[PDB]
Amino acid sequence: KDKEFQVLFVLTILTLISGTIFYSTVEGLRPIDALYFSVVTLTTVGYGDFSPQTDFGKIFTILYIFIGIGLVFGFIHKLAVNVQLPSILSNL
Amino acid sequence: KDKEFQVLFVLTILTLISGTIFYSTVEGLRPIDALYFSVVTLTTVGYGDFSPQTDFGKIFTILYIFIGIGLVFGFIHKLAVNVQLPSILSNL
Amino acid sequence: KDKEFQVLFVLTILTLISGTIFYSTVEGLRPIDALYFSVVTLTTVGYGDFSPQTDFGKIFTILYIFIGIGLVFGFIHKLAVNVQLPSILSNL
Amino acid sequence: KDKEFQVLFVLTILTLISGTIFYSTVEGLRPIDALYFSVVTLTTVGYGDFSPQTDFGKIFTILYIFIGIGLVFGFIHKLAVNVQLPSILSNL
Ligand SMILES: [K+]
Ligand SMILES: [K+]
Ligand SMILES: [K+]
Ligand SMILES: [K+]
Ligand SMILES: [K+]
Ligand SMILES: [K+]
Ligand SMILES: [K+]
Ligand SMILES: [K+]
Incomplete structure (x- = not known):
């Protein structure tokens, strides 16, 4: 799940880097x-x-x-389900 | 699944062709x-x-x-689940 | 399912009527x-x-x-799952 | 479920308060x-x-x-599933 999140994090970053380079x-x-x-x-x-x-x-x-x-x-x-959700529950 | 994807691909193309013709x-x-x-x-x-x-x-x-x-x-x-997802996993 | 769709259809229409009246x-x-x-x-x-x-x-x-x-x-x-989907499959 | 909804309600309010303060x-x-x-x-x-x-x-x-x-x-x-949905069904 943390590995799930790490991978999507990296892929998102790469996708945004590509757009940044293209549009600039x-x-x-x-x-x-x-x-x-x-x-x-x-x-x-x-x-x-x-x-x-x-x-x-x-x-x-x-x-x-x-x-x-x-x-x-x-x-x-x-992000919402595997990161925000547990910390929210934790705060309760 | 590939047939699922082919059909939605074709339908999307037709939907975009209709809009292209209408708005032009x-x-x-x-x-x-x-x-x-x-x-x-x-x-x-x-x-x-x-x-x-x-x-x-x-x-x-x-x-x-x-x-x-x-x-x-x-x-x-x-697209995301039946095409991008497997190639991503494959790259790992 | 057709009753599901009829109800959401009516509620959507009412929601859009309200907005039409308000914004006008x-x-x-x-x-x-x-x-x-x-x-x-x-x-x-x-x-x-x-x-x-x-x-x-x-x-x-x-x-x-x-x-x-x-x-x-x-x-x-x-609409997509209970109306468009079956007619699409039907066309096949 | 009502506790689910109360919490998301409070968190949404806090999120909107933060944006209100930042953008002002x-x-x-x-x-x-x-x-x-x-x-x-x-x-x-x-x-x-x-x-x-x-x-x-x-x-x-x-x-x-x-x-x-x-x-x-x-x-x-x-909101839609745990609040609007039951009142809609109730009205029927
Ligand atoms: K503009
Ligand atoms: K949007
Ligand atoms: K805009
Ligand atoms: K504009
Ligand atoms: K917009
Ligand atoms: K404008
Ligand atoms: K938008
Ligand atoms: K503008």
Whole structure:
């Protein structure tokens, strides 16, 4: 379970690193903005303060969402159930 | 399972083709923008860089969301569990 | 199951009627825009082409989301599994 | 179950209080706007009428989403299944 969580943690980090590199380079965002945009995208918040303006950016974003959402929410779920949940119960 | 995934893959593609055709035609978007908007809508990201401006567009969008979300996330789930998950485990 | 689906269908309609009335009245939207905004909100798309500008609107929106999301996605799920799924299998 | 719901209710309130304080202070929003933005963020609606403009705001928002989504939707689920569901059945 801790190994489950470690792996999803690492995969999430790699997914966000890829988005950070792509959006900084192709869409010209500052790295911090590119990370923030990647997170806002894959958690499906989607403020739209940043969004891809190039066709390369839009196509990547389509594929990035489809491949990354499953991982990100997998990680969030394991975070909530295997980490937050026990500490909450512990505090009781 | 591979047949499960093939079918949801095909249905997702058809759903996105329909949106691409509708939004290009009625909302005047370039086909690539219409595809990108369809994806951004049905994955519930919703940047709002594109959004329907006509009443025909808004009504279609209501019905498109209700009918398409279930399919798109079904596909994402099977992608994550039946495709990404095994290759990840394989890499270990 | 058909009774399950009928009930969630009716409840969803009532939830969207309430939002349509509220946003038309308090936020001044045309009824069609108010319906479209209610749907875009409760499915968590959130384009932001419309959003509440009054404090009454923001407070209602907080409570509307918390109470309506569970119903809307319940309906979407039953739609997908109890309606779309069988017709898809039938087409095969 | 009522104890389950009470706890998630309290935790959700604390999570929203934290966001309200952070966004009022660091992003300069009025408290009501900060609460509304916190809710719009953690339910993944993401209108983008408000969004963090400072780097401190963007970094907090990344961490806030990852930690808060699981709690907020946990609460929504228990609300829907353990509160709305029985009263609906009761009305029948
Ligand atoms: K959004
Ligand atoms: K914008
Ligand atoms: K916009
Ligand atoms: K969303
Ligand atoms: K969204
Ligand atoms: K938006
Ligand atoms: K806007
Ligand atoms: K905006």
